[PDB]
Write a protein that binds this ligand. Structure first.
Ligand SMILES: CC(C)CC[C@@H](O)[C@](C)(O)[C@H]1CC[C@@]2(O)C3=CC(=O)[C@@H]4C[C@@H](O)[C@@H](O)C[C@]4(C)[C@H]3CC[C@]12C
Lengths: 237, 193
C-alpha cells in the first residue's frame, strides 16, 4: 500500500476540478439577458440547456489543459482527446450537480432541472438515462479525488486515429495507478471491488456519450438550434 | 448449411452453452437469464471472437477456421465492427497477452450486468459481478505479480468493447440463424435444452 507523490498529483486535480466547476457569473448573466421577445417558455429551458453547455465544454477544455502530460502531446492529439472526452466528461460534471432529494440537476443558474425541465425543452427521451446515471453515481459515494482522477483517466483514453496513442496510454497509466493507490489507502475493505466499480463507470460513459450524439442527430432532424461550438466539437452536422 | 451460416449457428450455441455453465447463472430467474444474454449478446460474441483471433493475421476467426478478412466482413456479418475489433481489441489483446482465464472473467463481468434493461434480480446479479472482480484481481496478482496495472488494464478494454458494441445495429449473426423466431423466443428455448 501507501500513496507517494501522487498525493501532489491528487491535490492538483482536486484543486482544478474545484476551480473549473462553475462558469463565470458574467457568462451565465449573458445567457439570462438573452431571452427573446416573450420566450417560448419551454425555450427558456431549452436555450439554457444548450447555451450553458457551451460553457460546460469550455470548462472541460480548461481543466484538461492543466493536466500533467497533456502538454507532452502534439496539437493534433491534444485536440482529438479533447473532442473525444467532452461528452463523456460532461456526465461527471452533471452528476456532481445532482440533488438526490429533489431528483434534479442544479444548473449554474441556480435553476433545478427535472424530468420535466428536460422534457419541456424537448429532451424527454434521454432525461431519464441521465438522471439514472446521476443516481447510480450518488449511490457509489464517489468523492472529489476519485471524481477528478476518474475524469483524467477518461481524458487520456487512447482512441484509434490518435497519432501517438502509446504515449496517451502511458500518461493515463499514471492516473490509473494514483486512483488505485488512493482507493486502496482509504484502507477500507472492498478496495479492489470499489476500484473495479469506479473504472466500470467508464463503460457507462461510452453509452451515455453515444446517447448524447444521438440526441444531437435528432435536434438536427427536428431542426432546432444546436450551438455551432457544440456541432464543431462533437462533430454534429 | 452455409459456411458462415453454420459458423453463426455454432457461435451462438457456444455462447448460450458458455453462460449456462457460469457458476450461478442458471440459478437466476429464467426471464433474467434471457435479459442478461439478450443484452450482453453483442459484446459477448465480440470479445469472444476477438480474443480467439489474436493469432490470425489481418482477420477475425469464427467458430474454428473461417477466418473472415476485411474483403468480406460484410458477408460474415461483422461489417460494422471489423476495423475497430482488430485494433481496439485484437491488437490490444495480443499486446498484453491476455489469457483465457482473464477473457472468461471479463466476459462474465459483461454477462453479469445489473444495469441490464428490465433485469429483475439486479441486486443478485451485482453480487455475482463483484465476485468476478475479486477473483480476477487475485488471479492477476497471483499469475502476473510484476504487472501492477494489469487488472485495471484488462478492465479498461470493457469500455472499448462497449463502444464497438454500440456500432451493431442488430444482434450479431441473428438473422443468419436457421430458426425465424424472436430473439427472446430463441434464447428461451435455447436455454432449456
Ligand atoms: C446535447 C446537449 C445540449 C445536451 C447536454 C445535456 O444532456 C446535459 C448533459 O444534461 C447538460 C445540460 C446542461 C448542463 O450542461 C449543465 C448545466 C449547468 O448549469 C452546469 C454547468 C457546469 O457548472 C457543469 O460543471 C455542471 C452543469 C450542471 C452542466 C452539466 C451537464 C448538463 C446538465
Amino acid at each position: 500500500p501507501i500513496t507517494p507523490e501522487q498525493e501532489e498529483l491528487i491535490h492538483r486535480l482536486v484543486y482544478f476540478q474545484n476551480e473549473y466547476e462553475h462558469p463565470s457569473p458574467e457568462d451565465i448573466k449573458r445567457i439570462v439577458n438573452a431571452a427573446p421577445e416573450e420566450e417560448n417558455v419551454a425555450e427558456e429551458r431549452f436555450r439554457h440547456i444548450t447555451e450553458i453547455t457551451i460553457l460546460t465544454v469550455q470548462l472541460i477544455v480548461e481543466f484538461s489543459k492543466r493536466l500533467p502530460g497533456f502538454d507532452k502531446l502534439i496539437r493534433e492529439d491534444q485536440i482529438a482527446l479533447l473532442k473525444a472526452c467532452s461528452s463523456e466528461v460532461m456526465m461527471f460534471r452533471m452528476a456532481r450537480r445532482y440533488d438526490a432529494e429533489t431528483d434534479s440537476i442544479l444548473f449554474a443558474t441556480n435553476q433545478p432541472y427535472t424530468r420535466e425541465s428536460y422534457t419541456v425543452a424537448g429532451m424527454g427521451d434521454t432525461v431519464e438515462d441521465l438522471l439514472r446515471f446521476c443516481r447510480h453515481m450518488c449511490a457509489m459515494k464517489v468523492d472529489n479525488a476519485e471524481y477528478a482522477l476518474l475524469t483524467a483517466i477518461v481524458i487520456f483514453s487512447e482512441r484509434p486515429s490518435l497519432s501517438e496513442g502509446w504515449k496517451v496510454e502511458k500518461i493515463q497509466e499514471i492516473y490509473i495507478e494514483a486512483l488505485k493507490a488512493y482507493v486502496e489507502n482509504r484502507r477500507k475493505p472492498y478496495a479492489t471491488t470499489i476500484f473495479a466499480k469506479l473504472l466500470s463507470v467508464l463503460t457507462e460513459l461510452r453509452t451515455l456519450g453515444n446517447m448524447n450524439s444521438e440526441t444531437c442527430f435528432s435536434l438536427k432532424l427536428k431542426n432546432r438550434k444546436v450551438p455551432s461550438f457544440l456541432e464543431e466539437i462533437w462533430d454534429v452536422v | 448449411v452455409s459456411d458462415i451460416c453454420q459458423a453463426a449457428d455454432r457461435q451462438l450455441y457456444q455462447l448460450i452453452e458458455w453462460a449456462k455453465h457460469i457458476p450461478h447463472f442458471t440459478e437466476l430467474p429464467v426471464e433474467d437469464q434471457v435479459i442478461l444474454l439478450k443484452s450482453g449478446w453483442n459484446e459477448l460474441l465480440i470479445a469472444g471472437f476477438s480474443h480467439r483471433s489474436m493469432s490470425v493475421k489481418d482477420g477475425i476467426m469464427l467458430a474454428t477456421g473461417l477466418v473472415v478478412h476485411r474483403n468480406c466482413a460484410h458477408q460474415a456479418g461483422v461489417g460494422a465492427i471489423f476495423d475497430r475489433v482488430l485494433t481496439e481489441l485484437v491488437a490490444k489483446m495480443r499486446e498484453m497477452k491476455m489469457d483465457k482465464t482473464e477473457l472468461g472473467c471479463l466476459r462474465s463481468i459483461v454477462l453479469f450486468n445489473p444495469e441490464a434493461k428490465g433485469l429483475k434480480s439486479t441486486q443478485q446479479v451485482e453480487n455475482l459481478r463483484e465476485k468476478v472482480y475479486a477473483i480476477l484481481e487475485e488471479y492477476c496478482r497471483q499469475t502476473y505479480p510484476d504487472q501492477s496495472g494489469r487488472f485495471a488494464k484488462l478492465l479498461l478494454r470493457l469500455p472499448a468493447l462497449r463502444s464497438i458494441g454500440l456500432k451493431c445495429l442488430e444482434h450479431l449473426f441473428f438473422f443468419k440463424l436457421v430458426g425465424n423466431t424472436s430473439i427472446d423466443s430463441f434464447l428461451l428455448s435455447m436455454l432449456e435444452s
